[PDB]
Amino acid sequence: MIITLIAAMDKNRLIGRNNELPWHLPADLAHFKSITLGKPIVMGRRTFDSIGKPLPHRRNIVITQQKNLIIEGCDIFYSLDDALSALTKEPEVIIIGGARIFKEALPKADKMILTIINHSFEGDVYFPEWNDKEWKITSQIKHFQFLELRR
Ligand SMILES: NC(=O)C1=CN([C@@H]2O[C@H](COP(=O)(O)OP(=O)(O)OC[C@H]3O[C@@H](n4cnc5c(N)ncnc54)[C@H](OP(=O)(O)O)[C@@H]3O)[C@@H](O)[C@H]2O)C=CC1
Numbered sequence: 001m002i003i004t005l006i007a008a009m010d011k012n013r014l015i016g017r018n019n020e021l022p023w024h025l026p027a028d029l030a031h032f033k034s035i036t037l038g039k040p041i042v043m044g045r046r047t048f049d050s051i052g053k054p055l056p057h058r059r060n061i062v063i064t065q066q067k068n069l070i071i072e073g074c075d076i077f078y079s080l081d082d083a084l085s086a087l088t089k090e091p092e093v094i095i096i097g098g099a100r101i102f103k104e105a106l107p108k109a110d111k112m113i114l115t116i117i118n119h120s121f122e123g124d125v126y127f128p129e130w131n132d133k134e135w136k137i138t139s140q141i142k143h144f145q146f147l148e149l150r151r
């Protein structure tokens with residue numbers, strides 16, 4: 001199983017604000033869709049609420065500590081470790097966020113797919129700092145930009 005983090009972030013690593021995104025970038029969302037189509041996507045409960053519904057044509061997996069919580073359309077796990085353990089036989093697992101999930105996933109991450117937006121927005125949640133010496137750029141396309149890093 002390859003563990004991949006996919007995130008859209010600005011130059012300060014901002015990813016969220018008041019549990020929404022600080023932008024709307026249609027080019028990013030269609031990038032996110034093709035990349036995640038047909039694969040297990042792992043998200044936190046707050047990120048699920050932000051989206052508002054299961055993303056179609058994907059196995060939506062939500063991590064919560066709420067034991068009575070049921071979300072229609074999605075699989076619930078009570079830790080990232082229970083999720084990853086249940087997806088052992090999968091060839092790729094895609095972690096979509098948010099800030100808390102990214103931070104816990106990062107040290108297990110094999111690959112990162114990052115949209116870095118050239119701007120500075122106001123917000124309150126961030127993508128965790130990664131040691132640039134531990135990763136290598138496998139692809140860079142400057143449109144914002146798409147950056148693929150492999151560990
Ligand atoms: N720019 C981007 O690419 C992305 C941005 N975002 C943005 O990020 C923000 C949401 O991120 P954030 O607020 O950090 O919240 P998260 O999306 O990380 O979800 C947090 C919740 O996930 C559950 N959780 C997290 N870790 C664990 C664990 N180890 N075990 C059990 N449960 C766990 C808890 O749920 P519970 O409270 O139910 O117990 C926790 O409250 C929003 O603004 C969203 O729009 C989100 C994804 C991608």
Ligand SMILES: CN(Cc1cnc2nc(N)nc(N)c2n1)c1ccc(C(=O)N[C@@H](CCC(=O)O)C(=O)O)cc1
Binds near residue numbers: 007020032050114
């Ligand atoms: C809040 N949230 C989390 C979110 C947003 N942008 C991201 N962008 C990137 N690059 N990576 C992420 N993990 C990411 N996550 C969202 C919000 C909406 C949709 C969404 O409606 N996407 C649909 C449709 C997108 C479209 O309109 O084409 C899809 O099928 O992927 C996805 C994630």
